[PDB]
């Protein structure tokens, strides 16, 4: 479509040349669907999450849709993987999940790849 990644971070307004929160250059990551961008540290991503989100068509929080069913319904039930940030409805998982776990939850794609 008409998407172009924004050249500034939604959080600190800096470009990739200078994160205004950290005072260091830092690449931006950009939503594949809407083009909004953020510095990974402004997005509060770990370094390994930062690498992961650059490997697929990462979506921002607002655009995130479930990998399994494709919808963005039921925000309260759309889990975000703590290793790759992909979204999965708790009710699209099999077995489905009643409540977000405590501490990290990671998706089946990451379990397959890293373990």
């Amino acid at each position: 479509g008409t998407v172009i990644p924004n050249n500034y971070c939604d959080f600190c307004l800096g470009g990739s040349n200078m994160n205004k929160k950290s005072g260091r250059p830092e690449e931006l990551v950009s939503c594949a669907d809407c083009g909004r961008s953020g510095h990974p540290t402004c997005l509060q991503f770990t370094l390994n999450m930062t690498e992961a989100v650059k490997t697929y068509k990462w979506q921002c929080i607002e655009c995130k849709s479930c990998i399994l069913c494709g919808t963005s319904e039921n925000d309260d039930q759309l889990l975000f993987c703590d290793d790759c940030d992909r979204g999965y409805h708790m009710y699209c998982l099999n077995p489905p999940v009643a409540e977000p776990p405590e501490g990290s939850w990671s998706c089946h794609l990451c379990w397959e790849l890293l373990k």
Binding site: D10, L43, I61, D76, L78, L79, F80, W105
Partner: peptide
């Protein structure tokens, strides 16, 4: 764990 809802609430600086 994070959901879209809890992630929105803890990342309040996003434009």
């Amino acid at each position: 764990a994070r959901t879209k809802q809890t992630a929105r609430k803890s990342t309040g600086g996003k434009a």
